[PDB]
Design a protein around this ligand. Structure first.
Ligand SMILES: CN[C@@H](C)C(=O)N[C@H](C(=O)N1CCC[C@H]1Cn1nnnc1Sc1ccccc1)[C@@H](C)OCC#CC#CCO[C@H](C)[C@H](NC(=O)[C@H](C)NC)C(=O)N1CCC[C@H]1Cn1nnnc1Sc1ccccc1
Ligand SMILES: [Zn+2]
Length: 97
């Protein structure tokens, strides 16, 4: 019929997300992480996408969350929505060496 809404529709609001990044000890921008649909799980730099539940760790001190979301989770709709299919495609294209 119609499909694909978020698994944890309680992390849909940016506020709810930066909420968790209060005790964030990492140089990976909390805001860009939250703004990218991410939220800390409570262990390490372990985050997830609120929509596609895509998990990410091992963040480099200067990674751009938006680039990572594309790469690891191309089929996220939230990503598609905020960034558009060219972005995702462009990211993946630059990757190629
Ligand atoms: C650099 N920028 C950061 C953001 C980054 O890229 N981080 C990477 C990362 O977090 N990734 C890579 C894609 C997946 C994601 C990890 N992930 N996925 N899901 N959750 C997570 S982390 C997490 C976990 C819990 C809560 C929140 C987050 C990565 C470096 O982090 C490590 C991790 C982990 C984990 C795991 C899942 O493992 C796979 C499912 C797989 N296991 C299987 O049973 C598969 C289905 N069977 C084939 C797996 O571990 N594999 C598959 C073949 C062998 C191994 C791959 N491998 N080889 N050597 N090391 C590895 S582990 C690995 C995983 C992804 C990329 C590279 C290496
Ligand atoms: Zn996602």
């Amino acid at each position: 019929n119609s499909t694909n809404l978020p698994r944890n529709p309680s992390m849909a609001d940016y506020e709810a997300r930066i909420f968790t990044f209060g005790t964030w000890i990492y140089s990976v921008n909390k805001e860009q992480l939250a703004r990218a649909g991410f939220y800390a799980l409570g262990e390490g730099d372990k985050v997830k996408c609120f929509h596609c539940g895509g998990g990410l760790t091992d963040w480099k001190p200067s990674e751009d969350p938006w680039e990572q979301h594309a790469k690891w989770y191309p089929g996220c709709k939230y990503l598609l929505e905020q960034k558009g299919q060219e972005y995702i495609n462009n990211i993946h294209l630059t990757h190629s060496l």
